[PDB]
Amino acid sequence: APSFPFSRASGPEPPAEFAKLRATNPVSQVKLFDGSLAWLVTKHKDVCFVATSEKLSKVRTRQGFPELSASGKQAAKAKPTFVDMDPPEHMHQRSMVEPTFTPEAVKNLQPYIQRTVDDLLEQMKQKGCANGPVDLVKEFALPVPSYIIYTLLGVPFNDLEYLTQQNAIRTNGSSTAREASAANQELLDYLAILVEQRLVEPKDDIISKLCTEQVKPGNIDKSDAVQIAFLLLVAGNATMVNMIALGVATLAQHPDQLAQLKANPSLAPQFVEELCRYHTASALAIKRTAKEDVMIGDKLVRANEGIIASNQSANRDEEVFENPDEFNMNRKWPPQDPLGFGFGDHRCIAEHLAKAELTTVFSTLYQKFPDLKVAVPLGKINYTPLNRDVGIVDLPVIF
Numbered sequence: 001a002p003s004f005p006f007s008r009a010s011g012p013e014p015p016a017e018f019a020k021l022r023a024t025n026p027v028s029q030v031k032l033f034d035g036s037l038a039w040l041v042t043k044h045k046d047v048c049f050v051a052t053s054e055k056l057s058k059v060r061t062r063q064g065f066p067e068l069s070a071s072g073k074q075a076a077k078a079k080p081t082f083v084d085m086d087p088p089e090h091m092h093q094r095s096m097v098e099p100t101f102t103p104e105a106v107k108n109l110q111p112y113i114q115r116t117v118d119d120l121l122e123q124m125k126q127k128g129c130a131n132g133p134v135d136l137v138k139e140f141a142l143p144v145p146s147y148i149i150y151t152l153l154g155v156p157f158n159d160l161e162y163l164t165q166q167n168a169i170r171t172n173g174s175s176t177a178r179e180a181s182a183a184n185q186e187l188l189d190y191l192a193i194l195v196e197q198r199l200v201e202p203k204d205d206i207i208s209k210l211c212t213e214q215v216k217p218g219n220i221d222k223s224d225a226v227q228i229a230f231l232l233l234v235a236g237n238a239t240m241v242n243m244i245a246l247g248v249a250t251l252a253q254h255p256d257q258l259a260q261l262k263a264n265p266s267l268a269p270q271f272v273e274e275l276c277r278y279h280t281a282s283a284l285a286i287k288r289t290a291k292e293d294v295m296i297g298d299k300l301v302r303a304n305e306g307i308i309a310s311n312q313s314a315n316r317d318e319e320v321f322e323n324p325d326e327f328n329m330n331r332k333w334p335p336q337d338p339l340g341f342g343f344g345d346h347r348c349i350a351e352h353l354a355k356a357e358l359t360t361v362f363s364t365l366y367q368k369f370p371d372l373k374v375a376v377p378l379g380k381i382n383y384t385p386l387n388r389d390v391g392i393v394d395l396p397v398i399f
């Protein structure tokens with residue numbers, strides 16, 4: 001059995017194994033970092049089944065749960081938030097914070113989203129690139145999702161820049177473990193203090209809603225509220241940064257499609273749908289353990305055996321998406337959903353927010369900077385390490 005996670009075939013490409021497995025062995029065993037074996041599911045139809053089957057569990061203290069690193073195994077010990085829950089606990093807690101992420105709520109947030117993107121682009125203009133390229137990640141891709149999610153949680157304007165930097169330090173590949181866990185402690189301590197404040201005078205933010213509607217009635221206590229606020233911050237932010245940077249890089253590699261976006265910014269939604277299919281930047285989140293024996297394709301998954309469902313592989317499934325390895329924002333979409341955001345009950349709570357952010361960015365970026373260009377050769381883009389989720393560490397641009 002091959003070791004898993006697989007490495008990406010190159011900087012922007014998924015692992016090569018998935019294509020071979022989809023054609024010859026779509027449900028296979030892989031070897032995890034700790035020698036334990038797990039089942040790997042690679043086809044769109046089977047990913048959808050894993051994501052929704054009531055015989056499979058996300059509870060991480062069940063025997064056989066497939067942790068991919070040593071830190072996930074100790075992370076498993078902490079009191080769980082709804083990302084690691086099964087029904088009916090899962091939706092009991094998830095529904096406490098879902099109101100802010102509904103399509104209606106996200107529609108009302110659109111003016112604020114546009115203003116955040118506008119402001120940060122204008123800052124970047126004023127900084128200019130008269131002394132060399134600027135890092136689109138640091139100047140724009142990192143603060144855009146960071147400022148929005150922090151603001152929704154209830155962080156006041158003056159604290160945004162410091163906390164944005166701390167959260168970036170958490171997941172920066174060149175941080176030592178001491179730097180990353182200190183940045184991590186910094187974030188938890190700040191949220192605990194903000195929870196204490198909102199318990200005394202609530203405002204109009206997610207933490208205030210949790211304090212008022214759940215903590216004070218006793219449905220949860222303040223430490224649960226900190227953990228839920230922390231989950232909402234860290235679950236999607238690094239992914240959002242990578243999607244933004246990956247969109248810019250992808251457009252630089254497909255000049256003809258960038259020219260269409262420049263001449264019709266209303267194509268941004270369709271560009272965003274294809275970006276999220278093609279660059280599946282969160283590909284290791286759909287994991288389960290089997291509560292009972294369960295049949296997936298021609299394999300029997302025994303109870304207490306772990307499953308990993310690759311939505312990355314599913315998004316390149318030739319049986320669903322014609323010419324899946326071509327980036328085509330003008331593609332015709334089948335009936336089946338792309339799985340960039342997962343599937344079923346656990347499907348990314350922030351799907352509508354994330355798409356509205358991505359769509360606002362790509363309908364605005366090139367209207368502001370019609371000559372935005374990646375300043376290094378495309379073969380020299382600094383992608384994330386090949387053993388991690390696809391992403392871009394830094395992206396020098398001129399405009």
Ligand code: HEM
Pocket residue numbers: 051082083084094149231232233235236237239240243276281282283285286311339340341342343344345346347348349350351353354
């Ligand atoms: C392009 C950006 C993003 C992508 C591609 C993405 C992707 C995903 C994926 C694949 C999952 C697993 C879903 C499943 O189990 O079926 C997920 C879950 C989740 N995401 Fe996102 N995400 C993004 C942005 C965000 C943001 C901005 C937030 C928070 C503000 C967020 C919060 C969550 C949470 C809380 C879950 C767990 C939901 C649950 O288990 O009920 N994500 N996301």
